[PDB]
């Protein structure tokens, strides 16, 4: 037995993405616990210079709304969808006290969240951003961590948002491409090595008529890793 990595898809945004669906994926933000109305996936992405720019409008509402992109994930060549993987999304993100924004990078199975990596700045009076990781969906969701990122260290700029699975260990990272190191949270989740995945969604909402943060998405890929072969 030997092993290799198997890339399922790669979006570089040099051209309009193919093999994806717009505004029809799965979101994780538990609006029903926050006094908000249902999350909305709407609007376009603009592409320039190998970068996707999600578009939102300042429209007064009680919900998060922005564009999403989704795709399907087949089993690896060894016939497993419960195996190890890495899901990597490069972003450039910046904020300011008056700005509000959120992104989710989600892995799903049969229409439900399995893992959700979020970054958000949810107040128009503070420039604090928060990195969170959630496992499971809806009433079963468990927010594994809520990390208030110190702004002196987590400056505006380039990051790799990563979800990795290594058996029962689920890791979320926010790698600081510009300055080194970054955010890292790993949890050993009971039975997670038996839980499959079959899809992904990336969602980039703003809230109501609040001014948006600066966000762009430069690369996306998912790979099955440590895939047995003979
Ligand atoms: Mg690119
Ligand atoms: Mg703010």
XYZ file of N, CA, C and O and ligand atoms in Angstrom, residues 95-100 121 123-124 126-127, ligand 2:
45
model
N -10.888 45.016 7.165
C -12.093 45.591 7.749
C -11.763 46.926 8.433
O -10.601 47.369 8.510
N -12.818 47.437 9.015
C -12.756 48.754 9.649
C -13.904 48.852 10.594
O -14.775 47.969 10.660
N -13.822 49.750 11.557
C -14.878 49.760 12.523
C -16.271 49.714 11.924
O -17.027 48.826 12.290
N -16.570 50.562 10.930
C -17.925 50.684 10.397
C -18.338 49.541 9.485
O -19.514 49.391 9.173
N -17.368 48.711 9.065
C -17.624 47.618 8.134
C -18.096 46.362 8.827
O -17.652 46.039 9.938
N -18.962 45.606 8.118
C -19.544 44.354 8.591
C -19.449 43.331 7.473
O -19.783 43.638 6.315
N -16.879 39.930 11.001
C -16.842 41.227 11.694
C -18.314 41.618 11.697
O -18.835 42.040 10.728
N -20.000 43.830 13.796
C -20.411 45.091 14.418
C -19.910 46.255 13.603
O -18.726 46.302 13.254
N -20.779 47.258 13.383
C -20.397 48.502 12.702
C -19.766 49.518 13.651
O -19.571 50.669 13.265
N -16.966 48.369 15.795
C -15.751 47.730 16.296
C -15.091 47.045 15.098
O -15.800 46.583 14.196
N -13.761 46.960 15.047
C -13.109 46.284 13.912
C -12.581 44.903 14.327
O -11.610 44.349 13.779
Mg -16.742 46.339 12.059
